Design a protein around this ligand. Structure first.
Ligand SMILES: N=C(N)N[C@@H]1CCCCNC(=O)[C@H](CCCCN)NC(=O)[C@H](Cc2c[nH]c3ccccc23)NC(=O)Cc2cccc(c2)CNC(=O)[C@@H](CC2CCCCC2)NC1=O
Lengths: 40, 154
């Protein structure tokens, strides 16, 4: 299995970008395997 | 072979390639999410990058050296996901993070949905610093996605 990387761009902030998405406040738990879960 | 930038993480078998993730090269260290590589070595041009550090619970791994990304979301400002989806050009998406409330403190979180192979795309503050990586999160009731802004310890 050949796992490799290739450049995709410079890391910069974009002026006048698309502002989208909501901003949810969520109670969550994190297990030792790195999985988040929602708290009922 | 280690020039700063955002990179696609690819796999190739006997046919074409697949994009399994994304990562950040900074200060000679490559940073990505553990579930992208499982700590496998990465080919970069002619060279090889070896895993140096990782933590399955943080879902992070670095190559060539210790974790270098230390910028933190200020809890207040909008951020940009520098999304690098498979087969698509890198695109900046600005958003106001929500919050994961956990027993061990609050983590900023972004309500943006992309394919699995977008994992490891960096999240930026206004100065262009990487405040975390995208791709470890939760699915809510309506089926949409919320990613933690996952940041390691330097
Ligand atoms: N499911 C939605 N809406 N969006 C996800 C976004 C994935 C972004 C990158 N991160 C991941 O791949 C991680 C890997 C694993 C890390 C583990 N430590 N993964 C995840 O965090 C979640 C975790 C999770 C699964 N269960 C949960 C329940 C509660 C809380 C947490 C979870 N894992 C999933 O989300 C798996 C899943 C579950 C169900 C369905 C699908 C995938 C199929 N969806 C997709 O094929 C794409 C579709 C988008 C493409 C772009 C346009 C918008 C749609 N979306 C998606 O694949």
């Amino acid at each position: 299995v050949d796992m490799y990387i290739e450049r995709a761009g410079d890391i910069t902030w974009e002026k006048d970008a698309e502002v989208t998405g909501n901003s949810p406040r969520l109670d969550v738990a994190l297990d030792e395997s790195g999985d988040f879960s929602l708290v009922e | 072979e280690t020039t700063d930038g955002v990179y696609r993480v690819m796999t190739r078998r006997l046919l074409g390639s697949t994009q399994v993730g994304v990562g950040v090269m900074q200060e000679g260290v490559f940073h990505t999410m553990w579930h992208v590589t499982k700590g496998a070595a990465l080919r970069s041009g002619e060279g090889r990058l070896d895993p140096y550090w990782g933590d399955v619970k943080q879902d992070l791994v670095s190559y060539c050296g210790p974790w270098k990304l230390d910028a933190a979301w200020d809890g207040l400002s909008e951020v940009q996901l520098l999304a690098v989806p498979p087969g698509e050009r890198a695109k900046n998406i600005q958003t106001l993070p929500g919050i994961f409330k956990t027993k061990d403190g609050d983590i900023g979180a972004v309500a943006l949905d992309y394919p699995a192979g977008t994992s490891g795309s960096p999240i930026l503050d206004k100065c262009g610093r990487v405040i975390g990586l995208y791709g470890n999160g939760v699915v809510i009731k309506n089926g949409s996605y919320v990613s933690a802004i996952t940041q390691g310890k330097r």
